[PDB]
Amino acid sequence: ASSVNELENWSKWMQPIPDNIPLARISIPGTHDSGTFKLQNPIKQVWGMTQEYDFRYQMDHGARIFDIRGRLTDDNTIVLHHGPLYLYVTLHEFINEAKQFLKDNPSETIIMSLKKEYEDMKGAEGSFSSTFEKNYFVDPIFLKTEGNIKLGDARGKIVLLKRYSGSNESGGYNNFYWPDNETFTTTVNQNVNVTVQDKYKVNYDEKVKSIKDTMDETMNNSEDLNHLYINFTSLSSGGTAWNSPYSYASSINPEIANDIKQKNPTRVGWVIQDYINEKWSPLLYQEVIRANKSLI
Ligand SMILES: O[C@H]1[C@H](O)[C@@H](O)[C@H](O)[C@@H](O)[C@H]1O
Ligand SMILES: [Zn+2]
Numbered sequence: 001a002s003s004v005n006e007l008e009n010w011s012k013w014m015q016p017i018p019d020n021i022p023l024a025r026i027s028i029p030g031t032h033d034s035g036t037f038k039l040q041n042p043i044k045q046v047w048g049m050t051q052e053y054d055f056r057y058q059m060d061h062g063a064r065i066f067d068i069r070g071r072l073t074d075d076n077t078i079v080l081h082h083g084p085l086y087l088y089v090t091l092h093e094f095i096n097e098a099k100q101f102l103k104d105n106p107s108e109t110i111i112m113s114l115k116k117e118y119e120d121m122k123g124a125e126g127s128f129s130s131t132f133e134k135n136y137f138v139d140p141i142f143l144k145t146e147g148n149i150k151l152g153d154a155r156g157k158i159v160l161l162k163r164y165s166g167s168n169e170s171g172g173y174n175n176f177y178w179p180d181n182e183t184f185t186t187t188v189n190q191n192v193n194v195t196v197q198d199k200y201k202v203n204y205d206e207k208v209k210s211i212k213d214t215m216d217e218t219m220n221n222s223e224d225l226n227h228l229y230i231n232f233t234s235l236s237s238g239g240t241a242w243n244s245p246y247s248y249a250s251s252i253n254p255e256i257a258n259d260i261k262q263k264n265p266t267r268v269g270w271v272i273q274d275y276i277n278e279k280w281s282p283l284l285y286q287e288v289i290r291a292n293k294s295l296i
């Protein structure tokens, strides 16, 4: 029993999508620097804040991909950071929130990108990868298989997207060379072609066109089941009120959301945005989710 309207329940939108559809094919909203929502100091915010609400709000609003940046501590734990700044959020904090969300909504899956954001603290008994694997990944909540991961196998679990080196355990999407500030194409789990638009520090106009260009490619290659498209709409801070991630998101989110609304495509990729909220219309994450209508 699956209807297109079930995509409108932002907490269970993946439910109507078939088990055999690769996550790569699905158009999924994601949040950039997901754990920066606790930053209070205006100076820290203008430079590194990318979200206003916590993880559950993000999830309840359709986001299923999270950009987690961590640092290994002397306590053999991983805490979230933005460069040298501790975000007052921990990795366990995110996983627990994800666990709760998945328990409440078992039809969904959570894709967690994990990147080492800052140098390890002195005193850790191991490495970033060995500590994450031993104290976190062992948890049954993490999918342990790879390949072109299908939705059915991911439901109720966290799917890892590695952005760190040294992994020694199978599961999720393998780490791959990720060039700096570019739109690039490469491969991951042997059979998945990946294209990423991550020009995080280009001028505003270059960024908008970059997002649209990669989305245009995605919309016209909608039947490529083993191709993964990740499109970051986020743009790094200029350090001022008129060029902070917030100011940029205020215009980019509605702009790109309108592109999808007008075009009404069957695929737009994994769209990772800053500031998921309901302040700007059309809502990007909603339009991204609605782009899965043809899969039902
Ligand atoms: O500041 C940037 C931005 O967060 C990009 O999205 C990420 O891919 C880069 O690694 C980071 O340096
Ligand atoms: Zn929290």
Ligand SMILES: [Zn+2]
Binding pocket: 074, 075
């Ligand atoms: Zn300590």
Ligand SMILES: [Zn+2]
Binding pocket: 193, 224, 226, 227
């Ligand atoms: Zn392809």
Ligand SMILES: [Zn+2]
Binding pocket: 061, 277, 278
């Ligand atoms: Zn809301």
